[PDB]
Design a protein around this ligand. Structure first.
Ligand SMILES: [O][C]C1=C([N+2](=O)=O)[C]=C(C2=NOC(C3=[C]N=C(C(=O)[N][C]C([O])=O)C([O])=[C]3)=[C]2)[C]=[C]1
Ligand SMILES: [O][C]C1=C([N+2](=O)=O)[C]=C(C2=NOC(C3=[C]N=C(C(=O)[N][C]C([O])=O)C([O])=[C]3)=[C]2)[C]=[C]1
Ligand SMILES: [Mn+2]
Ligand SMILES: [Mn+2]
Lengths: 335, 335
């Protein structure tokens, strides 16, 4: 249901820019930040697209040319992938899984090198894909600092206070190539996803879909990522992926998506849609109330499972024995 | 390989008194307490039958007539079972499993009532089976106190000190009917099993046979007992019971069996062999050394599994959700 750009500029996107998947989806509500329904969704830990926060308004003019001049000469972390899927891996956990071979590489370089490398790929017509991820701090140039200070800190700080969240833990500038895919994963923090340039399709799954999405072992370098290849799902290894249902939206410049903590998200930059720019705001979650409500939420059950996997790895002295012990505990007893 | 009683009194037992099972066994060593091999077995947490401890020497004269006179008028806990299998259940845990129906009953009665009830069953030729289990304390009569004080406390106290064990946690007098079976289970304490009257076949399994013996969930009333019916094993529910190998011995009057903590034991009173009397000594285990050796023993892995089941039940607020969460953690991730 592509929205129409103002001034009769045509549809913002067409469906042929969206990749094809096996599961059904329904739309995330697009609302005004003044609408009480938006506040109710955020308070209830459910996603919403806010259309008028002005959260990153001064950055709406950002593009590669403007950024290259004013971001200054600093090292920016650039990730590379041969396929459209970008596979992040925790280097610290690579020791436990010696047979793991990384499929993405990170290279620190200046902004001009990133722009030239991106243009070079297009000039060659190649299939190498790139992804820049860098924190918005004082190291950037003065003009970017002015834009950064111009974010709607009043709106987001009030959101932090009202929801009882913790501290702003990270702020990442995010520049990607058309067709790039960040595969399904979850984060342990609250996120506001502020779209700046281009369009990104965001597909979210509630925390109770844990059984349908098959995350890696906690000690694996791909911890918190789904094991299921969304392009070629292995229903024999992952039967419950046949039951997964998602919440889908396409975010464009000016939109902010609240991704609640522990919610799975799959994010792709629209095919043939140009480069994308996003700024992400992550906040530590609110502390658990000491008065535990025993129904118990899915995200709390996820936290329990993570803690058990972590404790078991420490107690056995080797995270690779977690699986055999768990199977010993369950087979013929709980299954 | 039935031993011959002294004075040409014939074989102590014949094989037709031993029940038939599906698994193979090998013999537990029968040794003198002065033999260094016996000390090495106890120190290494392996079973041994000691033939000459004199641990319960003054009780070797005990029988039903002598006990009835001198034990005095007190209440003794008598357990009843319709079948030869005695199913102990933890009454405290019965709340968690409402669908559990107990198969044994406990009734407090005086010693004369126990003797008459036992004789009554034989007079009727009935199939009701009975089992008396009572602590050796000051409540018993003066003559039983003299016998109790006459146990080889010097030998057993030295064993407690040498092995670093904790305190004598329980001392149970154990009187049963011929054919009685205590099904396979494990205890979390060190045990000396002092046979007094009649013969008992003891079948022990090392702690690493956990996977072949399928204990109940920790929160189940039958916690620490094997789910496998040794008389009719369900190989579909319990495939690894086809791999179980045990250590077997027949203990008679004067023998003491060390049952190391966490070792599975199945104990039966020989068919057509008369009543049996045993006194059990349980000691708390030695504290774990702070210098953990990372190979890690099977009994330590059992303790870890028990702790995880207990913690999970508390965290979820309902022990019946332990199974579904464990399966959620494992399916498609560790299995
Ligand atoms: O505990 C502090 C803390 C820190 N820290 O140390 O400051 C860093 C992180 C963090 N590290 O990485 C990400 C991340 C997550 N998700 C995405 C994503 O989903 N991108 C798709 C798209 O299109 O937006 C991402 O790009 C980065 C977050 C989290 C917590
Ligand atoms: O933590 C203190 C503590 C206490 N406490 O509270 O003092 C009681 C027990 C205890 N409770 O029951 C038994 C028991 C175990 N095993 C057998 C058995 O295997 N019998 C077969 C046979 O033929 O010997 C048994 O008869 C009783 C032991 C354990 C620890
Ligand atoms: Mn994320
Ligand atoms: Mn026992």
């Amino acid at each position: 249901e592509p929205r129409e750009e103002a001034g009769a500029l045509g549809p913002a996107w067409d469906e042929s820019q969206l990749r094809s998947y096996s599961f059904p989806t329904r739309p995330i509500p697009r609302l005004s930040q003044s609408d009480p329904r938006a506040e109710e969704l955020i308070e209830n830990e459910e996603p919403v697209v806010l259309t008028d926060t002005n959260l990153v308004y001064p950055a709406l003019k950002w593009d590669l040319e403007y950024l290259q001049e004013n971001i200054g000469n600093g090292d920016f972390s650039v990730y590379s992938a041969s396929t459209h899927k970008f596979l992040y891996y925790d280097e610290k956990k690579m020791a436990n899984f010696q047979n793991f071979k990384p499929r993405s590489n990170r290279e620190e370089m200046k902004f001009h090198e990133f722009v030239e490398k991106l243009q070079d790929i297009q000039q060659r017509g190649g299939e190498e894909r790139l992804y820049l991820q860098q924190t918005l701090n004082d190291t950037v140039g003065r003009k970017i600092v002015m834009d950064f200070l111009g974010f709607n800190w009043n709106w987001i700080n009030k959101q932090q206070g009202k929801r009882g969240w913790g501290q702003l833990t990270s702020n990442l500038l995010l520049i990607g190539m058309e067709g790039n895919v960040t595969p399904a994963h979850y984060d342990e923090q609250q996120n506001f996803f502020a779209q700046i340039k281009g369009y990104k399709r965001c597909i979210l799954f509630p925390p109770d879909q844990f059984e349908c999405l098959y995350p890696y072992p906690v000690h694996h370098p791909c911890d918190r990522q789904s094991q299921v290849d969304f392009d070629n799902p292995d229903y024999e290894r992952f039967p419950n992926f046949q039951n997964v249902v998602g919440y889908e939206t396409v975010v464009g410049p000016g939109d902010v998506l609240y991704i609640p903590m522990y919610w799975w998200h799959h994010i792709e930059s629209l095919l043939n849609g140009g480069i994308t720019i996003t700024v992400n705001f992550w906040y530590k979650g609110a502390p658990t109330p000491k008065r535990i409500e025993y129904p118990l939420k899915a995200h709390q059950k996820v936290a329990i499972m993570r803690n058990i996997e972590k404790m078991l790895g420490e107690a056995l002295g080797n995270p690779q024995e977690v699986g055999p012990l768990l199977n010993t505990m369950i087979k013929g007893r709980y299954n």
